[PDB]
Amino acid sequence: EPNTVSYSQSSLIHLVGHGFVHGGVTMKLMDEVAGIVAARHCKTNIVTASVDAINFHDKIRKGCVITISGRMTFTSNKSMEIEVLVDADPVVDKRYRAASAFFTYVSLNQEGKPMPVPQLVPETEDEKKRFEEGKGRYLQM
Amino acid sequence: EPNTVSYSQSSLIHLVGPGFVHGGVTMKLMDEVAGIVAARHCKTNIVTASVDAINFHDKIRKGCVITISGRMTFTSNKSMEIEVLVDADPVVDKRYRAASAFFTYVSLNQEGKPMPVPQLVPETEDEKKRFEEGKGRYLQM
Amino acid sequence: EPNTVSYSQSSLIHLVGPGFVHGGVTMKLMDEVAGIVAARHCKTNIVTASVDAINFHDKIRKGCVITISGRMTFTSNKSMEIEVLVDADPVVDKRYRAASAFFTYVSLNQEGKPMPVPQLVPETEDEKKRFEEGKGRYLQM
Amino acid sequence: EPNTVSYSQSSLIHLVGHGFVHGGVTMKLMDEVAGIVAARHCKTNIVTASVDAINFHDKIRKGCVITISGRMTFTSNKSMEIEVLVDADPVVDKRYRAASAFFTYVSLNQEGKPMPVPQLVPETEDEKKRFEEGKGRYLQM
Amino acid sequence: EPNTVSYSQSSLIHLVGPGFVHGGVTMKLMDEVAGIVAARHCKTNIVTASVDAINFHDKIRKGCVITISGRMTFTSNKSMEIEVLVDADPVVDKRYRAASAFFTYVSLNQEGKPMPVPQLVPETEDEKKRFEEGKGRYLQM
Amino acid sequence: EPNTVSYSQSSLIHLVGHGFVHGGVTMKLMDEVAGIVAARHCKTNIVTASVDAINFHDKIRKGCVITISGRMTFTSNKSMEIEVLVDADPVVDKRYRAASAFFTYVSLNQEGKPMPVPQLVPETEDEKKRFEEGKGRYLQM
């Protein structure tokens, strides 16, 4: 199971206490989850190279519990792509998709450059397809 | 299925940043989850009455993600008992139980005094078990 | 000169405390500046719709002061694009571009849906340029 | 005076700024005071082993100054018990007891296990009695 | 005994976490105590007018508990002077004076301008002393 | 340009989110800017020795952007004086002077005492005059 999607899949879950949560609070939390999955996959130092298609689908209010999930989608020789999803749940009554993004993470050698990365191996058809999509987005750079 | 364990079963997941985390930080996070399961159960504004047997099974190190899970175990007339379990998951390199506590919460009217509490019905045998034991601790008040 | 680039041109400057700063922190600060240029432009209460092409050009180290600058580039009917640039300035010992992003913001009425947006008029050639390119990215929606 | 109750007695005093202070904020602060007294008594690394009878006597509101006092009550060979009290004072007009708890602290050797602890010596009748009570609570574990 | 030094004599005690603490942190905490003694004295909403002679006698290290004490020294018609003293107490291993300042505070009406201030009556000789000197500094405005 | 006023001139710019900003928040931020200029001038460890004439000219409200500027004014053999200015700008419509102060910074040797400091050289008439004023304030200690 090392270097598979299920091995590094991670989530965080937060109680967020005008009235709605800033995009920045959400972005930061999305980057932490992606960091966590990058970290589980690599076991080295890890840093955000770029972030694409941060889309806020709709607002998040005070007293929601948000579930920030991450799954690795694709790896090049020296980079990891991680899809991050954000769901929001009211503490009284249902679950809705609030944000999503693709993070590309990099692992740095002692001179601050990307180094060879363990390769993600897509096992299911879902994973093979997301890998293929990841490859596409990466070649667009 | 309101007023069941499964109904208000709640958890939070936190990346531990800056190694040991001092008990105080964990306790606070345990109260957060406890608050959430209580608000889901009774739907009123909510306050902690007492906490018992906080056990730190062992230390929580930086770079762990902690799952803080909470389930209701028993309800008295005016009070609720809620078990909170903390699990620690190192990201590099082993998952273990880090802490546990029984929180007794109290539902308040819009002045001061605590109002009566919606009853909790167990369904599985283990839920039956836990309720007795819950019952038990209460009695010793 | 309301509704020009110069009108709502905004920036923040932060001392980085405790070395790399994780992408998440910078992203949040980029959103803060983006929010400020948008509120200056349209004067309504303001929310982030999406963020694109967040590029981390390279790492931001502790003991840097970062200039986070934001200028509006283009306005659709209901949306605004805002370029945010992050510059890093070590205090001891070299200044460099650290990150850049295009934020699309949205002006909201006092319920939910986004209201129409005050148009942006470019004046210099470079502003003309940037607006096209802005226009461009929008189209690809 | 080393290893006596008066030597390590400590307090912290905080201005706390729906309207009432969460149990978690109070618990955390109680653990810090107990940590401080454990630290004064030992002069080694120090960690919470367990917490018993956290009782919230009544609420704490914004703009109260809280006095969190700690006194060591009992020591076994490898553990310290510390009573923590929390008083709340309004900034205009009087002082009331808000919370109390017993913390048991441990000192860890380089392999993460409790090590021999300096022994508390109760000098007054009050201290001898609290020691005896402490011994009782400890044997209950 | 309202409007005496003893009436509004206030202090806070803080555990310094993460070694030197930068002046800024201490200054902020000195203002907090100053605010508290002023609110106790006049009972109106309260704001700092100026601070003088902040002296850092020497450095405040991590793992110190600091006592920040404040007493009123003098009242003009519209203003109050308040001396704040900071004491530092290492927990392991020596207690010393770390900083001192004279804060002049101002009582505000429910619009803008500062309202008149309740007079302060000294009683001990040292209080007499301090009031003159207080008087003195004011005059030099 | 090393050791001139322009070389170490620094600023920070913050979005501040009863309704007005505490003097303490402002003081802290003023000390950070002064620290930054002291740091640019010295390239060694740096600490606040004292602060004089913190004057709050008028209030700062939520949703203002504040510009905290620092410029070195004077150096003795072993100390640096830095003038700090604070301007406040509403996010809708103009700029006003909110606070000012003189910080004196010191650079410490390994035994915690001030060490010889690079000398500020005033190049313009404005700078020569502020130097002279700085010398005056310093001899008053």
A141 part of contact set with chain B, CB < 8 Å: no
Structure tokens at A128: 């093979």
What is the C-alpha to C-alpha distance for residues C50 and B101, in angstroms, rounded to an integer? 41
A138, burial (CB in 10 Å: exposed 0-12, middle 13-18, buried 19+)? middle
State the nearest Cα–Cα gap between E41 and chain F, in angstroms. 18
Q: At what angle do helices E23-42 and F23-42 cross, to 10 degrees?
A: 160
Is residue F80 within 8 Å of residue F120, measured between CB atoms? yes
Specify the resolution in Å: 2.5
Q: What is the DSSP letter of C115?
A: P
Chain-centroid distance of CA A33 in Å reads 6
The answer to whether the CB of A57 falls within 8 A of the CB of A98 is yes
Residue of F nearest to C14 (CA): F12
What are the φ and ψ backbone dihedral angles of F89, each rounded to 5 degrees?
-125, 120
Cα separation of the two ends of chain E = 29
Q: Is D16 exposed, middle or buried (0-12, 13-18, 19+ CB in 10 A)?
A: middle
Residues paired with residue F56 on neighbouring β-strands, in sequence order: F99
E58 catalytically annotated: no
Whether the Cβ atoms of residue A29 and residue C24 lie closer than 8 Å to each other: yes
Geometric angle at alpha carbon E60, from E55 and E62, rounded to 5°: 160
CA-nearest of C101, C43, C45 to C69 is: C101
What are the distances in angstroms from CA E80 to CA C5, E37, E76, E116?
47, 10, 6, 10
Is the CA virtual torsion F93, F94, F95, F96 positive or negative?
negative
How was this model experimentally determined?
A: X-ray
- Rounded to a whole number of angstroms, the distance from the CA of D127 to the nearest CA of chain B is 24
State the catalytic residue, choosing from D31, D52, D87, D126.
Answer: D31
- Residue D118 makes CB contacts below 8 A (sequence gap 6+) with D2, D3, D41, D42, D75
Is B in contact with F (3 or more beta carbon pairs below 8 Å)? Answer: no
DSSP symbol at A61: B
Distance of CA F1 to the CA centre of its chain: 19
Verify whether the Cβ–Cβ distance E24 to F27 is below 8 Å: yes
Single-letter amino acid, residue E126: D
**Do the Cβ atoms of A73 and A131 come closer than 8 Å?**
yes
Q: Which CATH class is domain C1-141?
A: alpha beta
| Nearest beta carbon to residue B27 from set D27, D59, D112 | D27
F40, F43, F91: residue with CB nearest C40: F91
Chains E and F are in contact, defined as 3 or more C-beta pairs closer than 8 angstroms: yes
Q: Return the closest-CA partner of residue C27 out of C95, C98, C90.
A: C98
How would you classify the pairing of strands C46-56 and A47-56?
A: antiparallel
For B15, which of A15, A36, A43 is closest by C-beta distance?
A36
Report the catalytic residues of B. Answer: 31
Query: E89 Cβ partners below 8 Å, 6+ apart?
Result: E64, E65, E66, E67, E95
Q: For residues C98 and A90, what is the distance between their CA atoms, to the nearest angstrom?
A: 37
Which DSSP letter does residue F94 get?
-
**How far A140 CA lies from chain B's nearest CA (Å)?**
31
Contact E24 F22 (CB under 8 A): no
Under DSSP, the state recorded for B42 is H
Beta strands in B18-122 (DSSP E): 46-56, 64-75, 79-90, 96-107
| β-strands D79-90, D96-106 pairing | antiparallel
Residue B135 CA to residue B138 CA, distance in Å, equals: 5
Binding partners of F (≥3 Cβ pairs within 8 A): C, E
The secondary structure element, H or E, covering residue A113 is none
Q: Contact B23/D47, CB-based, under 8 Å? A: yes
| Nearest residue to A61 (alpha-carbon basis) of A10, A25, A27, A33 | A25
Chains touching D by CB (3 or more pairs below 8 Å): B, E
Q: Quick check: F62 contacting C, CB < 8 Å?
A: no
Would you call B47 and D59 a contact, using CB atoms and an 8 Å cutoff? yes
**A89: closest CA among B84, B109, B9, B119?**
B9
User: Under an 8 A CB cutoff, do C31 and A20 touch?
Assistant: no
Rounded to 5 degrees, φ, ψ at E123 are -135, -50
For chain F, say whether E28 makes contact (Cβ under 8 Å).
yes
As a whole number of angstroms, the distance between CA D112 and CA D130 comes to 29
Q: Which residues of E touch F27 (CB under 8 A)?
A: 24, 27-28, 31, 51
